[PDB]
Specification:
The complex is a heterohexamer, with 5 copies of chain A (69 residues) and 1 copy of chain D (69 residues).
Chain A: H1 2-31, H2 39-68
Chain D: H1 2-32, H2 39-68
Helix pairs in contact in D: 1-2
The chains are: A mainly alpha (69), D mainly alpha (69).
Chain lengths: 69, 69, 69, 69, 69, 69
């Protein structure tokens, strides 16, 4: 309980830090989008931006489910 | 917990603000989606769109879960 | 905050209607590429279809969690 | 509240009816394609099956959350 | 009571076993990453593994959610 | 009773073990990536890292849900 819940919480903060690693790499991938490239590729970039937002939401739910228990 | 909890809603208002930010990019690319012969591109845009609506759902579930702790 | 639960339920059903449209766009798309000779395309079509379904169920969980408040 | 979970049940039962639809479609499509040349296409068969499994599970979570409220 | 969740447990253990099989199929395929060659394929392989990990997790959440009712 | 949760939590521990394995694979393949030609590929490595982050969050949620039941 109390120490694993602490381990869950450093797991959760390690995910936060992983998240800012990806928030930053999709921006670095958006800066590499210049001539507008290939349409399926454009869709790919947008797909990846969507899952980072999904990751963002699952992370808040994980934080909050930790707080709810 | 309310200071921890509202900073979680801080994050979630940033999250709404990003979702709408990306859905307009979907709408923008979804009318410039060139409906040519290859289905693979088409499926990718449909794929990205479902991903955006699921992200949407996760976002509201995240809203609900933090608010009904 | 009955107001916000109301407008949250608003977005919830606003999202239901966009999904029905999403799934309708894909019924058309996947149906009328009249003959298929592609494996990758074929699997992607299944991928989008599955995605839309979890969009479907996450939408339903979003409804239940909202009312479960 | 009485009619509300019936419409939720409506949605949930209609969803079941399509998961099973795509499980049949994935079943026969997934082994009617055996070109076997590049892990790209094979990894797609795999992703789709994985997605089919999460749709199953998410559907069960919706069923059970509805059972929980 | 005990048997209403049995009819549902019946469905969740079909799922575990079918997941039991997809992980077997992907690990053989993950084992056959013949030579090195394309990176896109490499990411697809990784994508597929993360999705069964996702599938595993929602499977266990589905179990616990069913145990909560 | 609580021993049932320990059987479940072990499956989650095996999930935790494989998660870090895939994580180790993803850092490893991102250094062997050494690609800057196609955005498609850059976004693919992004999709896989995003998926890794999500599965990861799902794991924290599953742990908490099992212990909260």
């Amino acid at each position: 309980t109390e120490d694993e819940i602490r381990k869950l919480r450093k797991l959760l903060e390690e995910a936060e830090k992983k998240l800012y690693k990806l928030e930053d790499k999709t921006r670095r991938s958006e800066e590499i989008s210049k001539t507008d490239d290939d349409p399926k590729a454009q869709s790919l970039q947008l797909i990846a931006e969507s899952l980072m937002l999904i990751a963002e939401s699952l992370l808040i739910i994980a934080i909050s489910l930790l707080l709810s228990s």
